[PDB]
Design a protein around this ligand. Structure first.
Ligand SMILES: *[C@@H]1O[C@H](CO)[C@@H](O[C@@H]2O[C@H](CO)[C@@H](O)[C@H](O)[C@H]2NC(C)=O)[C@H](O)[C@H]1NC(C)=O
Ligand SMILES: *[C@@H]1O[C@H](CO)[C@@H](O[C@@H]2O[C@H](CO)[C@@H](O)[C@H](O)[C@H]2NC(C)=O)[C@H](O)[C@H]1NC(C)=O
Ligand SMILES: *[C@@H]1O[C@H](CO)[C@@H](O[C@@H]2O[C@H](CO)[C@@H](O)[C@H](O)[C@H]2NC(C)=O)[C@H](O)[C@H]1NC(C)=O
Ligand SMILES: *[C@@H]1O[C@H](CO)[C@@H](O[C@@H]2O[C@H](CO)[C@@H](O)[C@H](O)[C@H]2NC(C)=O)[C@H](O)[C@H]1NC(C)=O
Ligand SMILES: *[C@@H]1O[C@H](CO)[C@@H](O)[C@H](O)[C@H]1NC(C)=O
Ligand SMILES: *[C@@H]1O[C@H](CO)[C@@H](O)[C@H](O)[C@H]1NC(C)=O
Ligand SMILES: *[C@@H]1O[C@H](CO)[C@@H](O)[C@H](O)[C@H]1NC(C)=O
Ligand SMILES: *[C@@H]1O[C@H](CO)[C@@H](O)[C@H](O)[C@H]1NC(C)=O
Ligand SMILES: *[C@@H]1O[C@H](CO)[C@@H](O)[C@H](O)[C@H]1NC(C)=O
Ligand SMILES: *[C@@H]1O[C@H](CO)[C@@H](O)[C@H](O)[C@H]1NC(C)=O
Ligand SMILES: *[C@@H]1O[C@H](CO)[C@@H](O)[C@H](O)[C@H]1NC(C)=O
Ligand SMILES: *[C@@H]1O[C@H](CO)[C@@H](O)[C@H](O)[C@H]1NC(C)=O
Lengths: 317, 389, 122, 49
């Protein structure tokens, strides 16, 4: 936001009388600029956890596991997956408002996520540590089950069952996203919180603040200097107050978003580039893996978990 | 631009980075003035020069509309002891343009014009005639020593000394509460009669039909100008309306509470108002210990209004596009980054994300290390800051 | 707490690579951690197997994976190539080998048979 | 907190002159309401594991 714009339309008189407040409203622009840089840094920290781009092979034999609902189709102009397209569709001036676009467009986010995803599929967690080291998916699955106290033979004997369960669960995700948009509330509330703040800020231009009129240009067209300056000054102390309120709200909201982003980067690092021994950090159940998915102004993790069921009661020693 | 950055930062040294410095705004090219025009002149001389006036008890409200005002000749002439206007400055009335004007005519004693002001309390103010506290208009008073003052007294003018109730502002009410004053020119100035008249305007909230002697200027479209429609000045670019307008309205108004769409004060065409283009301005530059060459980013405004390159950030000037992809050195926006490499110039490019690569894969091939290496990473964090009180 | 007073199993929390340790260093209005990491490099491409059928019995490794450089099979650990002769104490058994998929055939050396065979030779 | 209460006791004059500031003090009530919901969410996240 440009302070001089928001308060003074174009009027030199208002601008001169805003100058005499000195350098408040450089501070406001400064803070917003800090936020703007900071929002690019958050996205960078989350998605640029990878050293190099990996593209998936055209081989789709993984022991029965299906990943064509999260890998991009090469056919799209903007390379994205089915689930990504469900995500990007279920998320819905001249006062100084300059909407700076992000440094990383949604296509680039998709490139980064596809790279992370392909590295996860083809290289285990090894590309988190050092250079990527290839491996079959079934053996990677075995690795991950050995991590949670289950021997890998349990996989190799139940491989098709496990693959079918996994594919079915992915279908469940695809269904739940293909119908309901309530699940996107985490992102959606943020978008609403911002678009609402802008509207209230702009609506404050309609208030008189102790003046003869809520519009500046009427005052300029009907008074000489010594009293026009007074009425304008009434408007200034209050339009400026509105702007400063908006700045403070956005700053606090940004700090919250930062906490969320650091958490998301932690999850990306500790659950995509490896296996979390931290119980019920990445998904409920014993953790195996994860997959990331792009989202507008956010990220989506799909945790895959081992959940015991169908037990018996034994007498022990 | 570099000097603007140096002035903004309050240093003679500018580091590699992008710094916002200023704002760009398309200025008006000329002024266009527009007003309704009536072939009648407003009869104000008929009220100030009327030979017999209204008493304050039964004060005259004459109404004015459907005429061209000329206050300047009434101002510029000197016959008036005082000429005060409230919410409005007396020189400025010739600029505005109103829907109604009421001339409130009567006569009063001199010490009681201390009392006639709006919101000021007193006998005449509360019992005889009232002006609201939110009053807008002009009060004129001029001394009468051969007009309403004459030898042998003058009892044609009555004042109500008492009353059982107070007025709603702009109302007339029809010991006995009514009394008279004697007005000889022999008495002192405080006792002389004073012809006083109040011009209460209602500002434009409807089609205006009353304003000064100005001449219109022919409108233009598709060029930023300084308009004036029925007294509302302003700046922007005017264009024909795609809207469908209603035949009693004039002004289409925004969430921002500024005009967006008007109808011509003397034509039936409807014009959409767009403020002419603006945008923040920021400088792309490397550090000054390498070069003084720069580039400029005109945010949110493209290159048909300001080597040139069009980005979804805005218009970028001073940089050359390159279809190679080098990793980011300066961020800009929309996936574009800049740098200063080799003669030498600023260049723009689409950022790479690291090198394209792929992992070989099969269901019967694995890779195991044979060696290793011990790295040492640095990880810095802050823990505290200066304890200021 | 989690990288000086111990070893972080959290991947890529304290340094990039597998974490070993750290060292702290003072800094004005801050702190500096020096993570020390194990970074694999200089690998080869081996052809592998999930498991082995010896007599019908499926064999799986207790640790490591089965590898083949050529006309020979080995087992070895996972972040370092150190090929070992396969034995029944490197591996373990579960079930028959008709249920596994992608399996291969190989004989497993047994460390008991040579001593016992030596006694029959006597 | 109710802004109109805190500033104006019950007076219509004060309330009218607060209206003309427009919609500041809806923002304040809004923020406090966000806090109030948010404090229930915190407790829910902790204990309803
Ligand atoms: C992976 O799962 C997808 C699920 O859609 C499979 O794609 C479907 O395949 C059948 C025939 O194989 C088609 O009739 C469907 O139209 C496909 N659906 C979509 C949305 O593309 C895919 O075949 C599976 N992969 C393998 C190797 O079987
Ligand atoms: C373990 O549970 C799974 C389901 O969670 C069972 O797998 C299903 O088995 C039936 C056989 O009657 C099949 O019709 C289903 O298609 C299987 N499900 C899937 C997703 O493929 C499995 O049988 C259970 N194990 C035991 C020992 O009962
Ligand atoms: C795979 O590794 C084995 C074990 O080192 C290799 O077999 C040995 O090869 C050397 C010659 O390079 C011989 O002197 C040894 O006698 C072999 N040992 C045994 C037990 O056979 C084998 O050559 C390697 N394969 C390849 C393709 O290099
Ligand atoms: C591992 O060895 C067994 C025998 O030692 C192989 O089983 C033979 O498979 C062929 C092909 O099906 C049959 O014609 C023989 O009758 C089988 N023999 C027995 C004794 O069952 C088995 O195929 C080998 N495994 C692999 C992966 O090649
Ligand atoms: C058998 O296990 C089930 C687990 O729900 C339980 O109903 C039952 O109580 C167990 N046996 C005994 C003796 O409780
Ligand atoms: C003012 O000019 C307009 C032309 O649009 C016309 O409607 C109106 O009658 C004119 N008034 C005059 C000549 O005074
Ligand atoms: C009457 O007023 C008109 C203008 O209102 C002016 O021309 C004229 O001179 C006035 N009469 C006298 C006696 O001043
Ligand atoms: C930085 O500035 C000084 C003066 O221009 C110069 O001596 C020094 O070499 C510069 N640094 C580089 C990297 O050239
Ligand atoms: C400015 O507006 C659009 C926005 O990008 C651009 O494509 C166009 O070239 C410019 N305007 C015109 C009239 O060319
Ligand atoms: C830029 O891409 C265009 C494709 O339109 C091509 O003309 C040009 O040669 C590319 N730049 C280089 C360095 O090849
Ligand atoms: C050999 O390993 C290297 C690892 O970079 C790779 O170039 C090569 O593709 C591997 N072997 C096969 C058959 O792909
Ligand atoms: C991998 O799958 C392919 C199918 O094209 C098959 O030829 C190959 O033998 C399989 N390898 C294993 C170890 O199952």
């Amino acid at each position: 936001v440009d302070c001089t714009m928001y308060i003074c339309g174009d009027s030199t008189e208002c601008s001169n009388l805003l100058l005499q407040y000195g350098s408040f409203c450089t501070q406001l622009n400064r803070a917003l600029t800090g936020i703007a840089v900071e929002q690019d840094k958050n996205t960078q920290e989350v998605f640029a956890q990878v050293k190099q781009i990996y593209k998936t092979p055209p081989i789709k034999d993984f022991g029965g596991f299906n990943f064509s609902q999260i890998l991009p189709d090469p056919s799209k102009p903007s390379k994205r997956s089915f689930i990504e397209d469900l995500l990007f569709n279920k998320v819905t001036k001249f006062n100084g408002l300059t909407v700076l676009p992000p440094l990383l467009t949604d296509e680039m986010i998709a490139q980064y996520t596809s790279a992370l995803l392909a590295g996860t599929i083809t290289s285990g967690w090894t590309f988190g540590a050092g250079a990527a080291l290839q491996i079959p998916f079934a053996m990677q699955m075995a690795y991950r089950f050995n991590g949670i106290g289950v021997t890998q033979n349990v996989l190799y004997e139940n491989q098709k069952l496990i693959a079918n369960q996994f594919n079915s669960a992915i279908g469940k995700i695809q269904d739940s996203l293909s119908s309901t948009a309530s699940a996107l509330g985490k992102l959606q509330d943020v978008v609403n919180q911002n678009a609402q703040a802008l509207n209230t800020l702009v609506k404050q231009l309609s208030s008189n603040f102790g003046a003869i009129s809520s519009v500046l240009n009427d005052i300029l067209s009907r008074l000489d200097k010594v009293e026009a300056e007074v009425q304008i000054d009434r408007l200034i102390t209050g339009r400026l107050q509105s702007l400063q309120t908006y700045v403070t709200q956005q700053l606090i909201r940004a700090a919250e978003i930062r906490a969320s982003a650091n958490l998301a980067a932690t999850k990306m690092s500790e659950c995509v580039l490896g296996q979390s021994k931290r119980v019920d950090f990445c998904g409920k159940g014993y953790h195996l893996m994860s997959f990331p998915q792009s989202a507008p102004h956010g990220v989506v993790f799909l945790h895959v978990t081992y959940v015991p069921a169908q037990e018996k009661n034994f007498t022990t020693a | 631009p570099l000097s603007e950055t140096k002035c903004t930062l309050k240093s003679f040294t500018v580091e590699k980075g992008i710094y916002q410095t200023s704002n760009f705004r398309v200025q008006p090219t000329e002024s266009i003035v527009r007003f309704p025009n009536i072939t009648n002149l407003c009869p104000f001389g008929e009220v100030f020069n009327a030979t017999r006036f209204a008493s304050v008890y039964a004060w005259n409200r004459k109404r004015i509309s459907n005429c061209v005002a000329d206050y300047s000749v009434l101002y510029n002439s000197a016959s008036f002891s005082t000429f005060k206007c409230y919410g409005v400055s007396p020189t400025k009335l010739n600029d505005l343009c109103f829907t109604n004007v009421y001339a409130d005519s009567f006569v009063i004693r001199g010490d009681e014009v201390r009392q006639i002001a709006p919101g000021q309390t007193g006998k005449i103010a509360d019992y005889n005639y009232k002006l609201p506290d939110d009053f807008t208009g002009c009060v004129i008073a001029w001394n009468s020593n051969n007009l309403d003052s004459k030898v042998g007294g003058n009892y044609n003018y009555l004042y109500r000394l008492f009353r059982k109730s107070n007025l709603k502002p702009f109302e007339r009410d029809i010991y006995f509460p009514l009394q008279s004053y004697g007005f000889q020119p022999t008495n002192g100035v405080g006792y002389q009669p004073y012809r006083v008249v109040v011009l209460s305007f209602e500002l434009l909230h409807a089609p205006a039909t009353v304003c000064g002697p100005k001449k219109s200027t022919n409108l233009v479209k598709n060029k930023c100008v300084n308009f004036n429609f029925n007294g509302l000045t302003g700046t922007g670019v005017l264009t024909e309306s795609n809207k469908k307008f209603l035949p009693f309205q004039q002004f289409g108004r925004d969430i921002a509470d500024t005009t967006d769409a008007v109808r011509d004060p003397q034509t039936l065409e409807i014009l959409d108002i767009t403020p002419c283009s603006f945008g923040g301005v920021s400088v792309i530059t490397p550090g000054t210990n390498t070069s003084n060459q720069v580039a400029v980013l005109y945010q949110g405004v493209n290159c048909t209004e300001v080597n040139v390159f069009q980005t979804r950030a805005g218009c970028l000037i001073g940089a050359e596009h390159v279809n190679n992809s080098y990793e980011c050195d300066i961020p800009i926006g929309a996936g574009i980054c800049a740098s200063y490499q080799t003669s030498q110039s600023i260049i723009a490019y689409t950022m790479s994300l690291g090198a394209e690569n792929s992992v070989a894969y099969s269901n019967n091939s694995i890779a195991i290390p044979t060696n290793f290496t011990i790295s040492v990473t640095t990880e810095i964090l802050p823990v505290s800051m200066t304890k200021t009180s | 707490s989690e990288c000086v007073l111990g070893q972080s199993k959290r991947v890529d929390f304290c340094g990039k690579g597998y974490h070993l340790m750290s060292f702290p260093q003072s800094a004005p209005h801050g702190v500096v951690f020096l993570h020390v990491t194990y970074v694999p490099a200089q690998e080869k491409n081996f052809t592998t197997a999930p498991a082995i059928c010896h007599d019908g019995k499926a064999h799986f490794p207790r640790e490591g994976v089965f590898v083949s450089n050529g006309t020979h099979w080995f087992v070895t650990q996972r972040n370092f190539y150190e090929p070992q002769i396969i034995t029944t104490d490197n591996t373990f058994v579960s079930g028959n080998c008709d249920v596994v998929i992608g399996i291969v055939n190989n004989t497993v050396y047994d460390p008991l048979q040579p001593e016992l065979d030596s006694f029959k030779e006597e």
